[PDB]
Structures are given as C-alpha cells and as structure tokens.
C-alpha cells in the first residue's frame, strides 16, 4: 500500500542495489521485419508515457470522474430528494425501454461525472503548471490546495461556504504533503542506510566509525555534562 | 542573525574545487539501463567488421550522457554563488 511510488523513489539507492526502477523506459521498439499489425499494436506504448501531458490530463480527469461517480453513488444521489413525479416518469421509461436503468444512471451520474472530470483535469493542470517549481513544497501544496478548494466549493457547493472550503483545502494539502508527497508508512529504504564509494580501506572505515562513535557519546546528557558516577 | 554567523561547512564549490567527477560517479547508479544499452551497443559493434558508417553507438552514448547529466548539472548549479532562488519566488 503506497502513494506516489514513482515520484517518491531514491533513484541512486535503487540503482546501487540493482532494484528495478520505475523510471526505466517502458516502451516497445519494433524491428524492421515485423508485420504492419505488429507495428500498429506496438504504438500502445504511448499510453504508458507519463510525460505525455494530454494523456496525464485525461487520466487525471478520469480519476476525478470516478471519484465523482462514487460520491454520487454512495453519498450524493441518496442524500438529495428527487420529485415524485420525476421518479414516476423515470420508472415509466424503465418499464418501456429494454435497458432503461442504464439511461437513468447516465442521467443521474452525468453532472457528478462531468464535475469530477473537470475538477481533476483543472487540478492536474493547476498543480503541474503553477506549483511544480516552488521551493517550499509544503507551503506550495497548502496554498494551492487552499485556493483550489475554496474556488471549487464556491462553485460546486455554495459560494457562502468558501471559508470552510479554504480550511479543508489547507488540511488536504497538509495531508497530501504528509503522505502523497512524503514517504511516511511507505519507506523504501532503511533509516540510517547509506552507500559507500571511494574504495576506502576497511581499517580506515573502522577508524572513521570509531571517531563517529566518540562524537556520538556527546549526545548523552549524562556524558556531556559529566554526571556519571564511577562504575 | 544567521548571516552574521560563521559557516560550519566548506563544500568543494566553496573551496574553489570542481565536484564534477564525484557527482558523475554518484549519478551513474541513477542511470544503469542506458549504460547497459551502451555496453551492448559497443559489444555488438566490436563483434562485426567494417560496419556501415551509419551505425554508431553515439546515440546510446547520448542517451546515457543525457540521463547522467540530468543528475549532475542542476545539483552543482544549486551550490553556486548567484544561483539563489530569490527573496519571494
């Protein structure tokens, strides 16, 4: 169970260990002896291109639309009250049509699916083009999410409920920086692990680690302050 | 204030030294697929005799060097005087 695995990867450590790298090319190279069908079917590697911005925007919109459809299915449609006459007309349509339930679900989920698609695409474009070059990553995430969710709640829920949307955006940005951007509960390397270069002798490395341990003994408050009894 | 305090570290850039070789060595592990492709290209080119002149490993080498220097160039630049990010942005 991981979040943003490809972006949160120590490529140097992965290469040193020989672990497979998600940044390795995921593509197909046909030879000049393959059939035309092999040439065409090898073009599906374009769907694996994470640097194709059109594909990324489309997939972000698809994820947002899926979230919107799920919200409508579970919390949205059941919450609101459809007029009785409208429901009777819809059920009459279902009676007289062979697949009327699919049409009903298309009509009901269309506003939520469209809103989710638009929100996902706009959010991806906003984050990718406006905030991907900021120095303070946490502050950029918090500000971007705050503004985006304030605008979204001002137009999707109610313009009066925009302070709450801004606060929720701040909280969501903090959560996103904590888990989607940081490797918390998703560590891929041991804490304190390192790699060695320079072809230093083992005796030299042992001496350096002894020196480090001597410095490490200064981190104890009893040792540093000289508050130890003679054992 | 921090600016009024002495500096606790002296990097190679601040000593007037070039860390390019070390950063290349430490960014080579980031790019091993391209290095293996380049090695395969060299092995295949050494295999045959008087190959077509329009058959070079300069393109695998270009891919490998692009991958490696994508790691070594920005980092060193981040350590240079006059490369500060700015007061606000």
């Amino acid at each position: 169970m991981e979040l943003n695995s490809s972006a949160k990867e120590d490529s140097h450590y992965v290469g040193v260990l020989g672990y497979p790298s998600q940044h390795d090319p995921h593509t197909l190279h046909p030879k000049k002896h393959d059939s035309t069908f092999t040439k065409v079917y090898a073009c599906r590697d374009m769907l694996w291109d994470h640097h194709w911005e059109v594909r990324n925007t489309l997939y972000a919109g698809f994820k947002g639309a899926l979230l919107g459809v799920a919200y409508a299915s579970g919390f949205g449609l059941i919450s609101k009250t459809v007029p009785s006459i409208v429901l009777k007309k819809m059920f009459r349509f279902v009676r007289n049509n062979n697949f009327g339930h699919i049409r009903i679900m298309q009509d009901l989920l269309t506003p939520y699916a469209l809103t989710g698609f638009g929100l996902g695409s706009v959010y991806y474009l906003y984050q990718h083009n406006v905030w991907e070059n900021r120095s303070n990553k946490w502050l950029a995430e918090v500000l971007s999410n705050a503004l985006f969710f304030q605008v979204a709640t001002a137009v999707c829920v109610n313009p009066g409920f925009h302070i709450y949307g801004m606060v929720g955006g701040i909280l969501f940005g903090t959560l996103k920086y904590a888990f989607y951007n940081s490797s918390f509960f998703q560590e891929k390397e041991s804490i304190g692990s390192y790699t060695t270069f320079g072809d230093l002798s083992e005796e030299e490395r042992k001496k350096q680690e002894y020196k480090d341990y001597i410095q490490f003994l200064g981190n104890y408050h009893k040792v540093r302050n000289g508050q130890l009894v003679d054992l | 204030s921090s600016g009024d305090l002495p500096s606790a570290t002296l990097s190679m850039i601040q000593q007037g030294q070039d860390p390019k070789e070390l950063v290349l060595q430490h960014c080579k592990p980031n790019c091993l697929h391209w290095e293996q492709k380049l090695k395969r290209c060299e092995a295949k080119l050494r295999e045959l005799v008087n190959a077509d002149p329009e058959m070079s490993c300069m393109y695998p080498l270009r891919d490998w060097v692009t991958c490696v220097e994508a790691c070594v160039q920005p980092q060193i630049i981040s350590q240079l005087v006059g490369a500060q990010k700015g007061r606000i942005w």
Partner: peptide, 30 residues
Amino acid sequence: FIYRDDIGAFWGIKGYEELVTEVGTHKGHN
C-alpha cells in the same frame, strides 16, 4: 501529435540527434 522523446528529438524537432540537448531544460532543470 505525440513524440517519443527517446530518439534524440525533443518535442518532434529532429535536427539534433548527434548531441546532448535535453540536460538543464527537459532532463533535469538547471
């Protein structure tokens, strides 16, 4: 309307396959 970016041609511009052109702008960011 899509370009491979692994053939040495940045964004479909196919005149500079004989040199390293991406570093600092597309591959990395100086």
